């Protein structure tokens, strides 16, 4: 019987290419548009991924939809942080192998302020020397990081699935073979990074929502993203979102 972490590993989506032509000069508008198109394709792959996470398909179909719609930005920004961590280590934002925010791209107007919340994710993964097994558990936990204020239809099963992956994160940490005290510290550090993703996402969604809503910017989103964005905007407005935390404020 395979281990649960090996099952999470085998379903990890293959890295997608942006289809960005390097022979054409850069513009922030061109990069934003290309990234929205890439994001749509990454979200189609994220649906196929979530369906293969052991336990996910046992939740009510409405809960499956709810979790993907709440967590979509957290999943993209976290996987982006991982790719940036593995690829550069310098570091740069590595959206796709053909679309990296290199030093020349960083000179675009206000580029650092547009990238710093995402660069923080990769910087922390690097600082904490997060492993591939820890990362797989952490990303699954991000899919399970927000619920409606009144809860899910399959709340008991969701809590059991969530606890299972918290314990899986524990197993990955123990492999770093530190003492009981070092394991507790590492669990605290990794779960603090998980909590900080809610704050990273609020910044990214402020940008995403502004560019989606302001039609005078001529910033296109593919159907996959436009559908999730259209669904999420009223939920943020009416406070129908419970952000789950490992550490109380």
């Amino acid at each position: 019987t395979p281990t649960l972490v090996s099952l999470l590993e085998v379903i990890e989506p293959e890295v997608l290419y942006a289809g960005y032509d390097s022979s054409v000069p850069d513009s922030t508008w061109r990069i934003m548009t290309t990234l929205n198109m890439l994001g749509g394709r990454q979200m189609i792959a994220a649906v196929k991924w979530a369906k293969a996470i052991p336990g996910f398909r046992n939740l009510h179909l409405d809960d499956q939809m709810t979790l993907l719609q709440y967590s979509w930005m957290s999943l993209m920004a976290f996987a982006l942080g991982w790719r940036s961590y593995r690829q550069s280590s310098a570091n740069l934002l590595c959206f796709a192998p053909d679309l990296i925010i290199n030093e020349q791209r960083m000179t675009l107007p206000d580029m650092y302020d547009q990238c710093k919340h995402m660069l923080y994710v990769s910087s922390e993964l690097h600082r904490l020397q997060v492993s591939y097994e820890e990362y797989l558990c952490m990303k699954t936990l991000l899919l399970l990081s927000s619920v409606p204020k009144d809860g899910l239809k399959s709340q008991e099963l969701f809590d059991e699935i969530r606890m299972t992956y918290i314990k899986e994160l524990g197993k990955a940490i123990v492999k770093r073979e530190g003492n009981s005290s070092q394991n507790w510290q590492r669990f605290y550090q990794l779960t603090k990074l998980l909590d900080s993703m809610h704050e990273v996402v609020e910044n990214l969604l402020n940008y995403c929502f502004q560019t989606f809503l302001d039609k005078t910017m001529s910033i296109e989103f593919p159907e996959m993203l436009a559908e999730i964005i259209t669904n999420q905007i009223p939920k943020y407005s009416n406070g129908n979102i419970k952000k789950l935390l490992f550490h109380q404020k």
């Binding site: 649906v47 196929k48 993907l68 996959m224 559908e227």
Partner: peptide, 13 residues
């Protein structure tokens, strides 16, 4: 409505 996400979740794969 969320037609596309529902379909991706309902279809095989």
């Amino acid at each position: 409505e969320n037609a596309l996400l529902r379909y991706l979740l309902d279809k095989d794969d």
